[PDB]
Design a binder for this molecule. Sequence first.
Ligand SMILES: CCN(C(=O)OC[C@@H](CO[N+](=O)[O-])O[N+](=O)[O-])[C@H]1C[C@H](C)S(=O)(=O)c2sc(S(N)(=O)=O)cc21
Ligand SMILES: [Hg+2]
Ligand SMILES: [Zn+2]
Length: 256
Amino acid sequence: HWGYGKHNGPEHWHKDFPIAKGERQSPVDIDTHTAKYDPSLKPLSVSYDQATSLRILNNGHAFNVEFDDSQDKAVLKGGPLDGTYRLIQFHFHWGSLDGQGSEHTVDKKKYAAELHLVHWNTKYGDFGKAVQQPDGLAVLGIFLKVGSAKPGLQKVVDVLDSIKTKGKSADFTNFDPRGLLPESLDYWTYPGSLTTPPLLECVTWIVLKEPISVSSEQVLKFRKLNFNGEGEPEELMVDNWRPAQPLKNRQIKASF
Ligand SMILES: CCN(C(=O)OC[C@@H](CO[N+](=O)[O-])O[N+](=O)[O-])[C@H]1C[C@H](C)S(=O)(=O)c2sc(S(N)(=O)=O)cc21
Ligand SMILES: [Hg+2]
Ligand SMILES: [Zn+2]
């Protein structure tokens, strides 16, 4: 099945998911000089105060922190979005090396990692219905460079030992996702897709311009994660990013 190596990687995915070569694929390169400031963008609203995490999960591709989304608690609204999108989970993609790992790039510059906070459009009643919709999801993308530690990330780093291999999960309640955000909400936005199979074209992308900084030793611990399940040969979870895809006519709008 799909993965990130030579034989099952992003270059192979189109075979099971033809949409891989579609008209609104993610990620993209953000050409900062070509993105237009857009005055009809409302201010962005990230309300994460009442966010309730349930658990952390290694799914053999990344690790997912999953949230209770049965009630309106953690929502993204405003910016390019119409109505209310509920936070359901977040995850990261990262590299074997500090100079690679993000999915989006900024004038071709790759960051050490990229975090994705995933929200679904509440007009559609459940997450399952929204992903079948062109405006079904909003993903908040955040870059990670290597520098000083992100204190608000270390509870995630420490729990990773518990979820080394595919299929492992741990209780992970009361994680507050606000500690992962940078100061600025300046952003680029574009219409796009899931960056993993099924690569569905249901995503409004909102990518923060300001990177967060994490320590060398924090990213180093991401890299100790395994793609494999318990008691299979050891394949380190690194370089789980999809490269930039063709822009194809789309415009990237800047909020600033
Ligand atoms: C959690 C990351 N995802 C994902 O499919 O990872 C692996 C598959 C595994 O597929 N598989 O081999 O059975 O799903 N999973 O076992 O959690 C999906 C899951 C769901 C479709 S999601 O939470 O709406 C989501 S958003 C993104 S991203 N990178 O564009 O911001 C990606 C995803
Ligand atoms: Hg869709
Ligand atoms: Zn992602």
